[PDB]
C-alpha cells in the first residue's frame, strides 16, 4: 500500500551537493572558535562514517533480502543516496572549509574513536548477521537501520542545525537539511518493513522482539551519551544534545510501531528554527494563432 508513494517521494527528492554553492559559509566558518570548528568537523566525520556503512552495507543487504522489484528499487535508490550523495556531500563541505591536513586528521580520528567504532561494530554486525530466508535476522537488522536513520544521526545533525538556526553556516546547513529530509523518509520506510515482519510473529515472539529492540536502543543510547559528551563538552552543549537524541530515539521507536521510551523535554528553540522540465510534443495547432 505504500512502496509506490515512497518510490515517487524518493526520486522527486533527488539532489547533488554541487547544486549548493558553499563559498558563502567561508566567513561564518572563519569566525568560529577553534573548539567550535573541531566539534563541527568531528560531528560531520561521524555522520560520514554512518552514511558510508549505510550505503556500502546496510541498504544493499536489506535490498537483497526484501522481496519485490519495487521494494528493491526503493531500497537501491536509498542506498545510492547514502554513499553517492550523502557521504560525498560531507567531503564537499570539508574541502571548502578546511585545509587538507585538518581533513586528513579528522578521518584518522574516526578510525581511532572508540564510540564511533563501537556503534559501527554493532550496527554493521547486525547487517552481516542477516540469514537468507530468515525473517527474524532481517527484522533485527531493520531495527538497527531505523536506529541509525532516526536516532544515531541526530547527535551529529544537532550542530549544523544549531548554527543554521542562528543564521550561521547556512549553505552547509542547507545540505544537512536535505540529508535530514532523506533520512526521515528512509527511517519511516524501513520501519514499515520491520513492522511487517514483527506482525507475522506469535505474541511470545513479539515480546522477545520488543526486548531486542529496547535492549539494543539502550545499549546504543549509553554509547551515544559518551560520544555526545566527548564532542560537545568543549562547546558547552552536551546536555542540550542529549535531550535532542532522546527526542529522536522516540521517533525511531514510533517508526517501529512502538511506544515512546523517554519523557518529553524542551529542545533548544534555535535547533527548532534550524528545521529537467516536463516535455510535450508540438501539435500542428501550436504553429497557428
Amino acid at each position: 500500500d505504500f512502496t509506490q508513494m515512497f518510490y515517487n517521494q524518493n526520486v522527486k527528492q533527488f539532489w547533488l551537493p554541487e547544486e549548493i554553492a558553499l563559498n558563502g559559509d567561508l566567513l561564518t566558518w572563519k569566525y568560529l572558535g577553534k573548539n567550535e570548528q573541531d566539534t563541527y568537523m568531528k560531528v560531520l566525520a561521524g555522520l560520514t562514517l554512518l552514511d558510508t556503512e549505510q550505503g556500502n552495507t546496510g541498504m544493499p543487504i536489506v535490498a537483497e533480502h526484501v522481496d519485490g522489484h519495487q521494494r528493491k528499487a526503493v531500497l537501491n535508490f536509498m542506498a545510492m543516496m547514502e554513499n553517492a550523495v550523502h557521504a560525498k556531500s560531507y567531503s564537499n563541505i570539508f574541502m571548502t572549509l578546511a585545509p587538507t591536513e585538518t581533513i586528513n586528521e579528522v578521518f584518522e580520528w574516526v578510525k581511532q574513536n572508540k564510540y564511533l567504532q563501537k556503534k559501527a561494530q554493532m550496527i554493521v554486525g547486525l547487517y552481516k548477521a542477516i540469514q537468507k530466508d530468515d525473517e527474524i535476522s532481517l527484522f533485527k537488522a531493520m531495527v538497527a537501520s531505523v536506529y541509525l536513520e532516526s536516532f544515531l544521526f541526530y547527535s551529529g545533525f544537532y550542530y549544523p542545525l544549531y548554527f543554521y538556526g542562528q543564521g550561521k553556516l547556512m549553505q552547509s546547513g542547507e545540505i544537512i537539511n536535505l540529508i535530514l529530509r532523506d533520512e526521515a523518509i528512509h527511517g519511516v520506510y524501513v520501519g514499515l518493513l520491520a513492522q511487517e515482519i514483527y506482525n507475522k510473529q506469535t505474541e511470545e515472539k513479539k515480546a522477545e522482539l520488543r526486548e531486542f529492540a529496547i535492549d539494543l536502543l539502550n545499549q546504543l543510547y549509553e554509547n551515544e551519551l559518551e560520544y555526545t559528551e566527548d564532542l560537545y563538552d568543549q562547546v558547552g552543549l552536551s546536555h542540550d544534545v542529549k535531550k535532542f537524541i532522546r527526542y529522536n530515539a522516540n521517533k525511531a521507536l514510533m517508526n517501529l510501531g512502538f511506544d515512546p521510551y523517554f519523557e518529553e523535554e524542551d529542545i533548544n528553540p534555535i535547533v527548532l528554527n534550524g528545521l529537467k522540465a516536463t516535455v510535450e510534443p508540438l501539435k500542428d495547432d501550436d504553429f497557428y494563432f
Binding site: 558563502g24 566567513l27 561564518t28 529537467k276 522540465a277 516536463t278 516535455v279 510535450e280 510534443p281 508540438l282 501539435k283 500542428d284 501550436d286 504553429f287 497557428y288 494563432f289
Partner: protein, 683 residues
C-alpha cells in the same frame, strides 16, 4: 549590522498589514548620514578636487582641458543645484558600490552622483559648456542614463572601453579562427561582451585541403573561444562573458546545442560561452508542416555556390541546397529540434533565439548585409560583413564587425518631464560622441564598422515602472498603446536627430544610399499609419507633448531624403542590469520579476522594492512570471515595430509549464514579429 541595513530590512516587517516602504527612504538617509558622507573625500574647492583626480591618474586631462575651470565649475553647480536624492537605499548602494569613483585603496569615495554626472556630461559635450549643462540636466533629472561602460568609465584614465557589446564575424579558416580568438581576448580585456557568428565555419566532418573527415566543427572553435573568454576576464574582476551564434541549418546545430546540456562531457560543454541560435523562416515553415528538414555542411555549399550558407536567403536557397547532390546535408526533424531548443531553454535558458526573417524584413541596411546574428544580450541586430584575415605579411580584407553604443531613456522620468524629443536628441548626440571617441586598435573590423556605420543603440527602461505608477497593467491594451506611441515618438526624434547630425556634419553612414531610409521605404508604415494613442488615458499621459502625425512623418521622410541619416542604427533596448538600480527604474522594457527583491551582500541581507511600489499600485506591479507570456510578446512586438535593432526579450516561465508552452511562446513571438528572444527564466 549597520543602521541603514536594519532600516532597509524593516520594510518586510508589516505594520497594519502593509509593507513599510517609506522606511526605505529613511535607510537612504542613514546610508548617507553614517557611511557615504563619512567615507567621501572632500576638498576645499572643486579646483583642488579636479587637480587631485587628474594628477593621481583618476581622470583624463584631455576632456577637462577643453573647458575653462569656470565652465567646469558651472557644470558642477548645475549638477548640484538639483539637490538630487536617491529615493531608495539600493539606488545609492549600487551607485556607490559599482559606479562611484574610489581611491586606489578602495576605502574612500572620490565621486558623488553629481560629480560622476558632471564628469560624464563634460566628456559628452567635448568642449561645449552649454551642451555639458544640458547633459547634466538630462542625467540629474534621470531622463537619460548612459550604459554601465559609458557611465562608469567616461572621463576616467584607468578605464575600459565605453562599448561593451561587440559582434564578430568568423570566416571559415584557421587564420580567421585564430584572429577571432585574439580579438575576443582583446575586447574582453577592454571589458566588452563579445558575440561571434560561427555559421560560416564548416561543420564537423568536413574537408581541409581535400582531406576528408578533418574538421572539428564549430564545437572545437567554441571550446577555444570559451578558453579565451575564461582567460580574458577583465584583469580578474568579472567572469569573461562571450556568446556564439549558429544558424539552425548549420549541421553542428545539435552539437552546438549539446554544449549546453548538463549531461555533456567536459570536452563538449562550454561554461562561460553563451549560445544563440538563428532561426530563419524556412525552419519554422518546415516545423509547421512537419516536413523533415536538412542541416547543411557549410563548406560544401560554399564550394558549390561561392558564398557562405548564412550569406544567402535560405527561404529561396533551401530547395536548391536539398536538390543539389554536391551539397552535403543531414536529415533532421525540425519539430524535434524545436522541442530540444525548448528543453534546453527550460534547463539553462539557452540558446538565444534569433528569428532571421523577422529581423531582416524590417532591416534598413539589407543592401550592406542581412543581420546574421545578435550580441551577447540578443538585442543588437545590424548588418555585418565577414573579414578575410590572411596569413602573415599579407594584407587582410577588413569587413564590418558590429559594435553599437548603449544608452537608455528612463520612460517614467522622460514622460513626466514631457521631454521625449529633447531627451532622445541629447541621448543621440551623446551616443554619437561616444561612438566617435571609440578607437579600438586590436579589432580592425570593429573599428572600421564603428567609423563607417556610426551605429548607436538608444534603449528605454522603467516601462513597467511607469505603467504601474500610472495605474496601467503591463498586459493591458492601454500599456501596448502607450508603448506604441512612446516608441514611435522615440523613433521619430531619433531619426530626426540622426538626419540633423548628417546635415550638420555633411556625412551619412557608409552605404546609406542603398538603405531603406534613402529610398523612403522605412517611412512607409509611418506615412500611412497614425500611431497616436487610441485610448483617452494614454492621450492624457502624452498631454503637453507633440505627438508626430503622418504629416510630420512625411516631413521627416523628406528631410532624410534631402540630408541623409548619420547613424545606420539608432535604437536598441538593452537589459540595463545595474544602471536601473541607480536610476530607480525597472530593468529595460521587461516586466518586473519580483515586487520586492531580496539580495545578499557580504553577510548582510537587503530588500529592494520596485520603484514607486505602494499599496495602491501593488496590483499593477504584477510579477513577470504571473503574467501571460503572449501579452508580453504582444507588448514587445509593439515596441519592436518602432525599434530598428532588437529588444532584449527574456521569457518568464513558471515551473509548471512544459516545453510545449515554451515552444508556443517562441512560435507566437515569431508570428508577432519578435526579432530576438533572450532568456527563459523559470521561477
Amino acid at each position: 549590522v549597520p543602521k541603514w541595513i536594519q532600516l532597509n530590512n524593516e520594510i518586510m516587517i508589516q505594520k497594519d498589514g502593509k509593507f513599510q516602504f517609506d522606511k526605505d527612504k529613511e535607510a537612504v538617509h542613514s546610508y548617507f548620514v553614517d557611511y557615504i558622507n563619512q567615507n567621501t573625500v572632500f576638498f576645499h574647492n572643486l579646483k583642488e578636487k579636479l587637480d587631485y583626480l587628474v594628477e593621481n591618474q583618476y581622470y583624463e586631462e584631455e576632456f577637462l582641458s577643453l573647458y575653462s575651470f569656470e565652465d567646469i565649475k558651472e557644470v558642477f553647480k548645475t549638477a548640484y543645484a538639483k539637490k538630487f536624492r536617491f529615493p531608495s537605499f539600493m539606488s545609492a548602494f549600487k551607485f556607490y558600490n559599482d559606479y562611484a569613483l574610489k581611491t586606489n585603496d578602495k576605502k574612500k569615495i572620490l565621486e558623488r552622483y553629481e560629480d560622476r554626472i558632471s564628469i560624464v556630461a563634460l566628456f559628452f559635450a567635448n568642449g561645449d559648456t552649454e551642451k555639458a549643462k544640458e547633459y547634466v540636466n538630462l542625467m540629474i533629472n534621470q531622463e537619460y542614463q548612459p550604459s554601465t561602460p559609458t557611465f562608469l568609465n567616461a572621463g576616467r584614465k584607468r578605464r575600459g572601453e565605453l562599448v561593451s557589446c561587440f559582434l564578430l564575424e568568423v570566416n571559415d579558416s584557421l587564420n580567421d579562427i585564430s584572429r577571432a580568438i585574439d580579438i575576443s581576448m582583446q575586447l574582453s580585456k577592454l571589458g566588452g561582451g563579445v558575440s561571434l557568428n560561427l555559421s560560416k565555419l564548416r561543420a564537423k566532418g568536413e574537408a581541409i585541403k581535400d582531406v576528408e573527415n578533418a574538421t572539428k566543427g564549430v564545437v572545437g572553435v567554441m571550446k577555444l573561444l570559451d578558453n579565451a573568454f575564461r582567460y580574458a576576464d577583465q584583469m580578474g574582476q568579472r567572469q569573461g562573458s562571450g556568446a556564439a551564434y549558429l544558424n539552425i541549418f548549420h549541421r553542428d546545430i545539435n552539437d552546438f546545442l549539446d554544449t549546453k546540456k548538463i549531461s555533456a562531457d567536459e570536452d563538449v560543454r562550454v561554461k562561460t560561452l553563451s549560445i544563440g541560435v538563428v532561426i530563419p523562416d524556412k525552419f519554422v515553415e518546415l516545423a509547421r508542416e512537419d516536413k523533415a528538414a536538412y542541416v547543411f555542411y557549410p563548406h560544401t555549399i560554399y564550394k558549390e555556390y561561392g558564398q557562405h550558407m548564412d550569406e544567402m536567403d535560405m527561404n529561396e536557397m533551401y530547395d536548391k541546397f536539398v536538390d543539389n547532390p554536391r551539397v552535403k546535408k543531414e536529415k533532421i526533424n525540425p519539430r524535434k529540434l524545436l522541442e530540444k531548443l525548448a528543453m534546453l531553454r527550460s534547463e539553462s535558458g539557452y540558446p538565444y533565439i534569433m528569428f532571421q526573417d523577422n529581423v531582416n524584413k524590417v532591416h534598413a541596411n539589407n543592401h550592406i548585409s542581412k543581420v546574421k546574428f545578435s550580441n551577447l544580450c540578443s538585442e543588437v541586430l545590424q548588418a555585418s560583413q565577414v573579414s578575410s584575415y590572411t596569413d602573415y605579411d599579407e594584407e587582410d580584407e577588413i569587413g564590418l564587425d558590429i559594435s553599437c553604443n548603449l544608452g537608455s531613456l528612463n520612460i517614467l522620468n522622460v514622460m513626466e518631464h514631457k521631454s521625449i524629443e529633447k531627451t532622445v536628441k541629447l541621448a543621440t548626440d551623446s551616443l554619437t560622441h561616444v561612438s566617435e571617441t571609440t578607437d579600438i586598435r586590436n579589432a580592425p573590423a570593429v573599428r572600421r564598422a564603428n567609423k563607417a556605420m556610426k551605429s548607436i543603440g538608444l534603449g528605454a527602461m522603467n516601462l513597467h515602472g511607469y505603467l504601474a505608477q500610472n495605474g496601467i497593467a503591463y498586459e493591458s491594451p492601454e500599456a501596448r498603446d502607450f508603448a506604441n506611441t512612446f516608441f514611435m515618438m522615440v523613433n521619430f526624434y531619433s531619426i530626426q536627430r540622426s538626419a540633423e547630425i548628417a546635415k550638420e556634419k555633411g556625412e551619412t553612414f557608409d552605404q546609406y544610399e542603398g538603405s531603406t531610409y534613402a529610398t523612403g521605404e522605412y517611412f512607409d508604415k509611418y506615412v500611412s499609419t497614425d500611431f497616436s494613442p487610441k485610448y483617452e488615458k494614454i492621450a492624457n499621459l502624452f498631454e503637453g507633448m507633440h505627438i508626430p502625425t503622418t504629416e510630420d512623418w512625411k516631413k521627416l521622410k523628406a528631410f532624410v531624403a534631402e540630408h541623409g541619416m548619420y547613424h545606420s542604427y539608432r535604437l536598441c533596448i538593452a537589459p540595463t542590469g545595474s544602471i536601473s538600480y541607480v536610476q530607480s527604474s525597472t530593468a529595460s522594457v521587461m516586466p518586473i520579476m519580483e515586487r520586492i527583491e531580496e539580495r545578499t551582500y557580504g553577510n548582510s541581507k537587503t530588500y529592494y522594492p520596485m520603484p514607486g511600489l505602494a499599496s495602491n499600485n501593488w496590483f499593477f506591479y504584477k510579477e513577470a512570471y504571473d503574467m501571460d507570456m503572449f501579452k508580453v510578446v504582444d507588448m514587445i512586438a509593439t515596441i519592436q515595430q518602432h525599434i530598428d535593432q532588437g529588444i532584449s526579450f527574456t521569457l518568464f516561465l513558471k515551473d509548471t509549464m512544459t516545453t510545449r508552452d515554451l515552444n508556443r511562446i517562441d512560435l507566437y513571438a515569431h508570428h508577432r514579429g519578435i526579432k530576438t528572444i533572450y532568456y527563459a527564466r523559470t521561477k
